[PDB]
Amino acid sequence: LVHVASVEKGRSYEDFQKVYNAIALKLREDDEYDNYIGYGPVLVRLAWHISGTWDKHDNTGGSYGGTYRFKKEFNDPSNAGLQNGFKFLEPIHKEFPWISSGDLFSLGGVTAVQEMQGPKIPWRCGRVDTPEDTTPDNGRLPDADKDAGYVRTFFQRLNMNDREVVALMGAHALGKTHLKNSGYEGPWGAANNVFTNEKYLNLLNEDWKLEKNDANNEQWDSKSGYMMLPTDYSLIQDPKYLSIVKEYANDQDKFFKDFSKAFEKLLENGITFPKDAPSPFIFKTLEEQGL
Ligand code: HEM
């Protein structure tokens, strides 16, 4: 498969900045969701799950075709709870019907990170909606009950290396786990809707204990009332991942720079951009615009 990026006809930077603005204003307004965490966390989870289905071997899956809109992918067990992020974005798509699904789902992830005080993420437009038979089969997204070898191998299918994987996993300081969605329950840390290097500090400084939760799954719980997945615990069990964890724990700006590079790579996997294509856009925040 080849997937060539095609800009939505006649649209420029200013059109996409208006879709970003609409997502950012609604994030501000619907502040009460999930006990006042807001929708920022589930929107960056949605952007990673529509991108995480990519397979480098045959170019299937990934963000291009916007196939999460189809039933097979929408009802994948691994996507449980993302229906909330979808319903958030739906009035926004009615307001700007010209944007493709893949572009809207991925831009929601970018808008969430920047509005939660994260780094600027360069974003490219041009994903094109593809038919229901291009929808990937369930089962390509990663299990949580596994170790650092599983993690390294999994992320190789998206050709992410060690530094990219540890930077990406920094997103597990956002939001929380929910028993009814995944069989895991608890907050990741103290600041769950502001983007920081907190995951790495908790990984190095908390007194973590292995326990079973009410769904019979194992998770690591700390004295502070925080939890972590087995796959997050991996990052301090593997010697290569651990030196990168330490690096991000001591330097939030290095974490922001690397997360920014790896998250854009993730959202662009499987997409060929022509060089007539516009450069990646850097959107201004509401605050930068005085809105
Ligand atoms: C081995 C990799 C990964 C596994 C196994 C994994 C698994 C999970 C699970 C089980 C949850 C809890 C879902 C729930 O109960 O609602 C979760 C939440 C979340 N994940 Fe991941 N994750 C992985 C990678 C990532 C990456 C790479 C990102 C983003 C760049 C990410 C972002 C998030 C966010 C923001 C949440 C919180 C969502 C919310 O608050 O509703 N995860 N993850």
Side-chain angles (χ1 to χ4, degrees):
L1 303 178
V2 180
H3 302 122
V4 185
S6 186
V7 183
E8 289 96 333
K9 202 157 153 38
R11 309 297 178 185
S12 75
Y13 174 64
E14 297 73 32
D15 293 287
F16 288 110
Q17 183 65 262
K18 298 178 193 87
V19 182
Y20 175 108
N21 289 176
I23 298 165
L25 262 349
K26 191 177 169 57
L27 281 175
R28 194 150 97 179
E29 178 182 76
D30 297 6
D31 68 320
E32 69 301 297
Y33 171 80
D34 214 0
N35 287 70
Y36 288 78
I37 293 163
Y39 285 89
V42 77
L43 287 190
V44 345
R45 192 176 167 234
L46 174 59
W48 140 243
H49 273 216
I50 61 115
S51 301
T53 56
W54 188 60
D55 191 339
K56 69 176 184 188
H57 301 110
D58 61 1
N59 210 21
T60 61
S63 62
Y64 188 85
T67 51
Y68 175 70
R69 92 175 90 100
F70 300 120
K71 312 72 169 286
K72 192 168 78 180
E73 185 160 351
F74 193 82
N75 291 128
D76 185 351
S78 317
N79 290 330
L82 294 181
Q83 300 90 349
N84 299 325
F86 182 74
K87 284 184 272 278
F88 178 94
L89 290 177
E90 214 192 74
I92 289 161
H93 214 180
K94 298 303 173 302
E95 193 179 344
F96 306 87
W98 56 262
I99 196 163
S100 60
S101 302
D103 281 359
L104 179 68
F105 299 152
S106 58
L107 180 59
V110 173
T111 309
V113 173
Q114 300 194 166
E115 289 302 306
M116 288 190 291
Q117 331 283 275
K120 288 302 182 80
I121 312 304
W123 179 88
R124 287 188 173 246
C125 56
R127 293 168 218 201
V128 183
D129 282 14
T130 58
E132 190 164 41
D133 66 316
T134 61
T135 301
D137 287 315
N138 299 355
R140 306 187 174 196
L141 289 163
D143 298 318
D145 69 328
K146 302 284 197 284
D147 68 347
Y150 174 87
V151 177
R152 187 167 275 106
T153 286
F154 176 82
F155 272 110
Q156 148 288 129
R157 202 191 73 217
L158 314 174
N159 62 253
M160 289 306 166
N161 63 16
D162 290 352
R163 173 158 231 95
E164 294 168 340
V165 175
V166 178
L168 254 28
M169 216 64 85
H172 274 185
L174 304 170
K176 64 187 293 285
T177 62
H178 313 82
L179 200 80
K180 196 175 187 57
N181 296 344
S182 62
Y184 296 94
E185 180 59 50
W188 308 117
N192 58 181
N193 66 6
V194 183
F195 199 89
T196 66
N197 69 339
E198 205 194 328
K199 190 64 173 200
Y200 307 115
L201 294 170
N202 289 355
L203 240 40
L204 299 180
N205 301 155
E206 294 287 298
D207 181 21
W208 297 99
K209 177 174 68 179
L210 185 63
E211 316 184 272
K212 286 209 183 71
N213 65 26
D214 309 320
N216 290 227
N217 293 127
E218 305 207 304
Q219 45 179 79
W220 291 88
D221 302 333
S222 80
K223 239 66 159 62
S224 305
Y226 311 148
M227 65 71 81
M228 208 206 42
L229 300 175
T231 49
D232 299 333
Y233 203 72
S234 286
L235 304 192
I236 49 174
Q237 285 179 150
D238 183 277
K240 290 147 78 193
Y241 288 157
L242 179 61
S243 53
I244 303 161
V245 174
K246 293 192 185 177
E247 209 189 303
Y248 292 158
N250 292 294
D251 192 357
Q252 190 177 75
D253 300 333
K254 183 61 161 62
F255 167 53
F256 276 19
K257 267 85 285 163
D258 292 359
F259 180 86
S260 185
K261 292 195 260 72
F263 193 57
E264 182 177 14
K265 176 169 180 179
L266 176 74
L267 302 186
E268 289 172 7
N269 278 337
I271 308 168
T272 311
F273 291 98
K275 221 214 68 63
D276 44 85
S279 313
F281 302 140
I282 304 288
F283 299 111
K284 291 185 178 298
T285 64
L286 295 183
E287 182 179 316
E288 277 157 338
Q289 297 170 274
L291 296 168

